[PDB]
Amino acid sequence: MVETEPVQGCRDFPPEAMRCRRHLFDVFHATAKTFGFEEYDAPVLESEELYIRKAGEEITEQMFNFITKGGHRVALRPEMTPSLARLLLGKGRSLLLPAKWYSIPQCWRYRRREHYQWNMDIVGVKSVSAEVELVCAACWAMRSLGLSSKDVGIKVNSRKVLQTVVEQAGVTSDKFAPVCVIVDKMEKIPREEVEAQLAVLGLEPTVVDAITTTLSLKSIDEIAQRVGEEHEAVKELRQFFEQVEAYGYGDWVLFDASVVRGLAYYTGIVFEGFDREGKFRALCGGGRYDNLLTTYGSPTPIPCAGFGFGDCVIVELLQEKRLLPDIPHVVDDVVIPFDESMRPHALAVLRRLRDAGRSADIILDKKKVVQAFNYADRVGAVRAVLVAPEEWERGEVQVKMLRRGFAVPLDRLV
Amino acid sequence: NMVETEPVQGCRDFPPEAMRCRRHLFDVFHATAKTFGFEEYDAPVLESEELYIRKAGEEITEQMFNFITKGGHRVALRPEMTPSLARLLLGKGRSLLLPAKWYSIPQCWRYRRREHYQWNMDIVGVKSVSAEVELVCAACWAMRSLGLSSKDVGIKVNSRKVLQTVVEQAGVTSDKFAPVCVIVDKMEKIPREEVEAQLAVLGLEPTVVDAITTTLSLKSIDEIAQRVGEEHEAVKELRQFFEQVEAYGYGDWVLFDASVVRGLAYYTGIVFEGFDREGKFRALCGGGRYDNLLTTYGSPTPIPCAGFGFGDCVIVELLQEKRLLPDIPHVVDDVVIPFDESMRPHALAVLRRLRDAGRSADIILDKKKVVQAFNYADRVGAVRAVLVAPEEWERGEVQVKMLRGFAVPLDRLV
């Protein structure tokens, strides 16, 4: 026998599991539509060069890469944002801004080795309204799935606070991305180790202390005390919360000075969704990244913000909260030939049902009526349509509702 | 200076314009599957190479995009979906209720294009030709849904059992039958001398090659009946098939062609392929019955199966030629325009309201003047512009303009 299990770290989606994935993806799509985002896609295979950012990111470290027959360095995408940037760079001035682009790529790593990730990005918007919209969209999706502000929230911060603190200590700006990557590890590794890694990057103890203290500040007012009310981060975070409040999602968002995210490229506001019971990893994660397109060679800087929202953590949360009931397969009609001599007539009926916009099966194999009826019930049919010779002479069929029996004229079926 | 903006060799980018076209096609695939009662499934694009080692000289297996993992395992990006389907079915065993009708739209790979999407539809557990009938009707249904007629396209249908008998009657070992089909499939693409030469290499003497050639040239089912008998399975099955399609109302879409064998090793019975009636393009779709495949994978019980693949590239060319792919512009229902920044919070409340009612709506995110906001609304194909101005807001109103503006109460917007 062949190996029936999928390749290591990869998931099969038979119909039962696919209904769940589809339930989630319907919401991603519907939220994107609601918010005016346009769908896009790019190949799962990208040039390895696209991901060589040299900032010690977990995402780039764990790349599923390989060498082609022909010698080119390629990888299965670990994330979508670089692909997005490539596409935008390729369009150049022909791209109308602002642009709001979304996709649901499968992404890879070399435990799980694959996941689907809803991406939403806003391009060409300088102001925090982008971050506001992005954060509102994530919440909207979660609410659409049945979660409340009691179940989840979005922690929000700005990397600019830490940028100032780092820059005020004389630390070269090129070290800032590494600092964020390192400091992101606070939750997952001991503070001694995070401190040790910053030393290796070349930062003296008093600078590491200032970094640590600022991650512990518990309000925007406390940020304002340390760096000034006029500091960009304060201004931007205030606007952000004001706008979310106005949109009516105030209960869903909050400030957290320890949120930096682990990606090199975030320059401004960053955020991540979390379950308020502290049971799961981040539900989604994002931020502003205004320099990325410059680093790729854009002659003009291009503001961007966005987020990724994985398919795995959300499903665990929903299961825990009992918000993923099994969704059984449904079809409107199952057409049942009384016997094989009635199959041609049954096919005409089937045709008619489908032409009217109904989902319909015909029993394909040779079955007795009661077995056909059982099958109809298994596939979750709303209605069984028996095509029998006596009724057919009347220009009729027998109909029976499943969610005992009625003759109906052919023309009145739909 | 700049990252490579082109995608990896042989792979396509789908920016929003191109994605709308793919999505238009995929909507039809999905809708046809739903109409026909098929259930969605999916499996990893990465599969064990062992899954595709069929040793029949198939083009599909020859052109595999395969590579070796760091851990030394032979894997491949799937060249087709049918082996994955079989794996999943084998994995479910007796827990799978039959009949089953499963569909998917996988991206499949090969090493000038290296990548395509392919709608798969398969019926499992149905011994009789009604499966093939349904499959063929579904392909036609999809094509008709896209605007094609029986004047534009058709499905050529045959049975491999005719050739099976002819080959078996000449004393040719049954294990050589799959190779014969693979070779004979090449008739349309390469000279008859070469096809004859390849069969000789497989070990068949000239008179056997003649019998093969003659049977591929038979022009009707009656002529098949003369050669192998009216009671031969193929004749019986093909007659039932055409009778059923006729009854379903798709008789003008289908026809007999004795030269159709397909290039896959595993087809045992009826085979078919869609074609444009102008003779301009390669096959639009292709499929057949494959009743032994699950036995070769190690199923203790034989499991009847039939299905088809329907690629995303040929159909698009046909539709373009026929002027059935008008540019589908991006649409959104509402664009909300703050009169100025002081009106943004109120605008956000309006935006929230619009979206809560099931409408797709943007808000202008950056600072711009009203007429420029109006232009932008028109670019994104907005049905309606909603101006949020201080005077109207005091009235509990906004100004609406369809794409002379007029005032509307907030509650009457939706």
Ligand SMILES: N[C@@H](Cc1c[nH]c[nH+]1)C(=O)O
């Ligand atoms: N690529 C980020 C999410 C994101 C999308 N856009 C901007 N950021 C991640 O994987 O975490």
Ligand SMILES: N[C@@H](Cc1c[nH]c[nH+]1)C(=O)O
């Ligand atoms: N896998 C076949 C199509 C098919 C699906 N099911 C049965 N046949 C192909 O790639 O041509």
Ligand SMILES: OCc1ccccc1Br
């Ligand atoms: O964090 C999970 C994950 C991230 C990136 C690629 C693949 C996976 Br699975």
Ligand SMILES: OCc1ccccc1Br
């Ligand atoms: O016939 C085109 C094709 C077949 C299989 C995989 C990838 C492609 Br492109």
